[model samples]
Target: GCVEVDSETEAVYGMTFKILCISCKRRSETNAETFTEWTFRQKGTEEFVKILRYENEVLQLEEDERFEGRVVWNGSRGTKDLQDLSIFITNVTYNHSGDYECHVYRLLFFENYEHNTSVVKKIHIEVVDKANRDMASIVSEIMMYVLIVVLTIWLVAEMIYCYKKIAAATETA
Candidate 1:
């Protein structure tokens, strides 16, 4: 019923990134042949590179040299057992931050016919430096929240002082 999936992924540098494209409650390789294609596009680039592809019991990850040995296959490398379509990428770097589009195709067969249905998801990855992680120390998370709190208290105090002064004052003739 839906072909587009709404999703986003953020990864810190030098870390492992895992994203579950979709939930397969009872999905398995017994009844369907699954196909997953991952494509990568930089933060501000028009070109897209093929990261890896899995289909028909084949897994290929030779798109980029750095990525050739980084993709994780969940027990489906040599067989069409894609019960898990989750993506696992390790050693994430700055170059890994970008838009990742995942395409999932399910091949279903009847007694005399076969049909293919697919869904595409957009995963936007934001890889930041490990040295400057945790927004609490990035001058935003903590400070922003603290600033709002301080201002909120200060405003309450000012309101009380103004009300007291206004109560004491009277209209002059």
Candidate 2:
């Protein structure tokens, strides 16, 4: 079963980033043909510009200067019925921060009538110079502080108990 995955919104400068898009057919056994189209709306921009088009196993990259030679088709291949419409940026740059919209047009063949469906997926990408700290490490650091506080309190309690025991023993003897 094909499952749609949400694309990662964060990208780092000078690193490769993937923009994912998937449109799964509920009925996989149905005969279908599909084509994928991609568009980009750069940050603080008004219009979305076409970036890529995929049809019949041939990929057509738009004449955008920014994405020239840097954009690569990383989507489904070897079939006309494409489920994945993802792409990769070889080297992400600050100017690459933007909104990418993927459009998938599918035609399903039936004996009586042909059914057509279109899917639109959008991904908002942010490009940063540095990678953000992971939340898992942040939570673990807080847990370390809590563990140290608990151990210190228990250590003080045990010290007081030992002193009290020693004093009582001397008096009893």
Candidate 3:
């Protein structure tokens, strides 16, 4: 009944982009303490730089080097058991094109003992100068035109049949 949606892998240069990372627990009844860590690896870079960490309702932006004042935490609020751990970047540049990794650590409290689990999700982003059309949108455009043509033809055929039926009834009268 729960799902972890995939993030968009493309970003337009000079525009804002959102990196989504969601982790849902199998059981919602059990209260859990969760936190997220985000790391970014730029193009041609071998090491991933730690950007920020979310814990105890406090956000700490580490390194403060490349993403200072430009990143925002757009994750879950009002609850300790966070399901969404996403971030937003403003004025994205070409240098922002790279790989992002989201690491979530959760501690589930049980009546007898405690349980912990970690989740890792990676997204490879490609920054383009212009936005490209998706294949799914193009397919839906063609289907719309085809449906219009079929409905028009059906209406014309029904009008012709109705006229012929009325003409025959007049001759009999």
Candidate 4:
């Protein structure tokens, strides 16, 4: 049981956004090879644009444009172990704000045989103008925490309510 691909989002317009993607290696054979494709969907866009792809121990990147000169592959672990699929995007802009996704296909060899599996992960990154950053970021975090707190209290109440009903029934018996 292994989670195949994972992602982390860090953003800065006109700067760098680090997409730290990691593939599961613990369950795979020690000599596993990973194939990955990186995709991007701009905000409010229904189509996913291909940003990068790595396979066959060679990186065939954005052949035409869009991310041709802006993408840097920084996730390679070495020559053989290609578990790290991270990347660095330079000169980011508002147009680049959207969902970044990574799809992974892993080949694990067992003795003289091999098996393959696929998994994908998405990281939502919202980059706002520096002027409006505080309110958007702060309010989002506050709302998330509020939701967690409300759910936790409701769960605790349910547990106590169940316990009390069970205790009363036991006493009557």
Candidate 5:
């Protein structure tokens, strides 16, 4: 199965952003005997940090320092529906941007009735900046101020020229 996630790529320097993961089962037959895991690794890091593992009862946090209080599971939905596997990464930072993997495992029984598991799926995550958002805003403000100053000078010059022309015409007449 594959999952789709929606989240803000670039957040403010100190703002909070939610990273959402929605797991959708791809194979109907494998859905009955499948399990899912959500893992994340910081950009340019090799180690994949396991945030949550779902089998029967949701596993409690083993207390990884990096993920302490940073990872949350939205299990309001049922596990069989695959909705319980969604994860939220709150208050994201620049370092938080990276490649993430959603792994799916399935338990299969051989002809001899021996049971084994296999990794069924994996998905990657990539986060990017919000498209020159900050620079654009600063440039816009600067342009606005420049335009205001130019307009003010033009208006004053126009008024002065008009007054001078009228005074000269009145004196000549």
Candidate 6:
């Protein structure tokens, strides 16, 4: 089985977002017969970028320049734990959003078999300028209040000035 996890749609630029992948073998399967891997493919690319591979033991990453130091395993969980393969991507960018793949292979007859299964996980990420967005909203609200106050003051002052002029004219007549 394959599972997918994603972060919120809109996040501030330079903020961190995580992509989680969880795989579970059927209860009937033995550990020796099950092996799992995580793969990532860019949005439009046909080739998969292998991020991490695990068999009997987890292998050191064949690091891709785009993902160097960006991918870290949740080490608290063991490799065979199936749930331990969650990966975190920090300082997330708009380009980070794409489809990822989780692959599992079942060993048969103590030989590596070609038969394997894969699940595709999709991620959608949004990047925004946090400070700019908040400031614009705040400024807009303040301008609305100021306009109301200025209009009220001008209307009251106009009424008072008109009444004084009329009273003076009547007295002089």
Provide the overall lDDT of each model, using Cα atoms, as 2-decimal numbers.
Answer: 0.69, 0.92, 0.90, 0.76, 0.58, 0.58
Q: Please, what are the lDDT tens digits per residue for candidate 2 over residues 14-103?
A: 999989898888888988899988989999897999988989998899898889889988889899889888999999988899988999
List clashing residue pairs in candidate 3.
Answer: none
> What is the C-alpha lDDT profile of model 1 across 22-93, one tens digit per residue?
624243333556788888888779887888887776678855865766778653445453545666776776
TM-score of each: 0.60, 0.81, 0.83, 0.65, 0.48, 0.49
lDDT per residue for candidate 4 within 35-118, as digits (tens), equals 789888988888888878887666778774557777877776455557677777786777767888888887777888888878
Question: What's each prediction's clash count?
Answer: 0, 0, 0, 0, 0, 0
Which 10 consecutive positions of candidate 3 have the poorest summed lDDT? 63-72
- Show where candidate 1 strays beyond 4 Å: 1-8, 23-30, 75-83, 130-173
Candidate 6 weakest lDDT stretch, 10 residues: 75-84
TM-score of 3: 0.83
lDDT string for model 6 (124-153, tens) is: 444566724466789999999999999999
Question: Cα RMSD to native, each candidate?
Answer: 7.1, 3.2, 2.7, 9.9, 8.9, 10.3
Candidate 2 structure lDDT: 0.92
CA lDDT, candidate 6, residue 111: 45
Q: Which stretches of model 3 miss by more than 4 angstroms? A: 1-3, 154-173
Instruction: Summarize candidate 3's per-residue lDDT along 31-109 as a digit string, tens digits.
Output: 8999999999999998988889999888899966668877888888877899899999887888788999999999999
